Amino acid sequence: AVTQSPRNKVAVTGGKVTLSCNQTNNHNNMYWYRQDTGHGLRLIHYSYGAGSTEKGDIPDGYKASRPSQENFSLILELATPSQTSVYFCASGGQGRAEQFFGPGTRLTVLGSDYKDDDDKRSGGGGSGGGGSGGSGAQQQVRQSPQSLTVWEGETTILNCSYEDSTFDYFPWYRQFPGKSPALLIAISLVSNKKEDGRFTIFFNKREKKLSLHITDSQPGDSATYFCAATGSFNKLTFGAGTRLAVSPY
């Protein structure tokens, strides 16, 4: 079924990344994402009808192959101190299903951030450093940046935006614990107000954005929710949702 390299190991500057995922859980489409802040979800590989696994967002420095629609495998041989992350082999069906995330892998290439309090955040000594391709890739999903933590698991409000002209709905979901993403629900922006569980959504026309309310929350960094769209087929556009957190006191 949807699985990933059960092994666990780390790599160094251009070390190596061994990953192995399988597909056979009744899913007609297998998506591949990676936990990467800045934008949150990081699409890199795409496999749904076999012979397909290289059309995420900015695939580069990785090798993947899909000889069989059920068997898959990919690795890397040149990672940088800011590209590694946790590989998650997600696989769901079409229409409205939860991404059956399996035991993904987690490895980092070079890096530590243990005592970086009295040093500049720019190692000007090789290892890339800007270069060509400074900006690019447009953006549609715009979730209120600047995360925030509320006292205890109180309620909170979220905001999302979009610049597409053919979106159908936005499967509100991402991951609550830290290494186990999951689907929650899906809006549609057609009734101006909806409710699925204990939170409702609103349609802001004056600002063209989606705002919902979530009450009754629990500690543990609260949870991270993303707002992506999928009006098209095999194409989810996310814009780094928000990461709700709970205060220590």
Q: Do domains 1-111 and 112-229 have the same CATH topology?
A: yes
- Separation between Cα atoms, residue 152 and residue 154, nearest integer Å: 6
Please state the domain extents for the chain: 1-111, 112-229
The structure's method of determination equals NMR
Contact status, residue 133 vs residue 118, Cβ threshold 8 Å: no
Q: Where are the beta strands (DSSP E) in the chain?
A: 17-22, 29-36, 40-41, 45-47, 62-65, 71-76, 85-92, 105-107, 149-150, 156-160, 173-175, 181-183, 193-195, 199-204, 209-214, 223-226, 242-246
* Burial category of 69 from C-beta neighbours within 10 Å (exposed 0-12, middle 13-18, buried 19 and up): middle
DSSP 116: T
Asked whether the beta carbons of 160 and 170 are under 8 A apart, the reply is yes
Q: Taking Cα atoms as reference points, which of 161, 164, 146, 158 lies closest to residue 184?
A: 158
Assigned token pair, 145: 């940046």
Rg, the chain, Cα only: 19
CATH 2.60.40.10, applies to 112-229: yes
Region for 104 from its dihedrals, namely left if φ exceeds 0, alpha if ψ lies in -120 to 50, beta otherwise: beta
* Sign of the dihedral defined by the CA atoms of residues 21, 25, 30, 32, in that order: negative
Identify residue 142 by its one-letter amino acid code.
R
CATH architecture of residue range(s) 1-111: Sandwich (2.60)
- For the chain, count helices (H), then strands (E): 0, 17
